[PDB]
Amino acid sequence: VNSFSGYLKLTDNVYIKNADIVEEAKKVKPTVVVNAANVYLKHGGGVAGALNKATNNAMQVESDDYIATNGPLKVGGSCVLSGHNLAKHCLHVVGPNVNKGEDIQLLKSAYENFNQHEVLLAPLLSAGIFGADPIHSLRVCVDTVRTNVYLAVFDKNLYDKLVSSFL
Numbered sequence: 001v002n003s004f005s006g007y008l009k010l011t012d013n014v015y016i017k018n019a020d021i022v023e024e025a026k027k028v029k030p031t032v033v034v035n036a037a038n039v040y041l042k043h044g045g046g047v048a049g050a051l052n053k054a055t056n057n058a059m060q061v062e063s064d065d066y067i068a069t070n071g072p073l074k075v076g077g078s079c080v081l082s083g084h085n086l087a088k089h090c091l092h093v094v095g096p097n098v099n100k101g102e103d104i105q106l107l108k109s110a111y112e113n114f115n116q117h118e119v120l121l122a123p124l125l126s127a128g129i130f131g132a133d134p135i136h137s138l139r140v141c142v143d144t145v146r147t148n149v150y151l152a153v154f155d156k157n158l159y160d161k162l163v164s165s166f167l
């Protein structure tokens, strides 16, 4: 039993809700919140900008130190950093950016990072400002993630479509 509320069950381990991941984070304080990161951990907009703003830019400050030490992430890769006031940990995961010509096949690799954590609050990777179809992202998620994932989908019409077209 966990504290996630009002999620529609899609499969054994995947749950979905029309919600702002920032608000789900502020209310639940999960062990892991997933950020839809880019390779530079530049949290300017989208999920990343929203999470970072909610941390009063502390996420960006921590991220800049991480990059200065370690260099950029790989597309499809991840790192674990602090969750600040939102979660215990933030798993920064880089899905491919279709607008940059990045290989959509890397979306599966991106979702594989979730399997290192028993329970996560997450967005649909590569969707939104990253350019991919959220329907496709959801299918890759369901077919790749084996741990318990709670998805917050920001857009109501897209959520309804994600729900309606699933089975």
Ligand SMILES: Cc1c[nH]c2ncnc(NCC3(O)CCCCC3)c12
Residues within 6 Å of the ligand: 019, 020, 021, 022, 045, 046, 047, 050, 123, 124, 127, 128, 129, 134, 152, 153, 154, 155, 158
């Ligand atoms: C921008 C933003 C702020 N707070 C959020 N919480 C969740 N998702 C977000 N954007 C990505 C997505 O949900 C958009 C609809 C289709 C699936 C992907 C955001």
Ligand SMILES: [Cl-]
Residues within 6 Å of the ligand: 046, 047, 127, 128, 129, 130
């Ligand atoms: Cl977005």
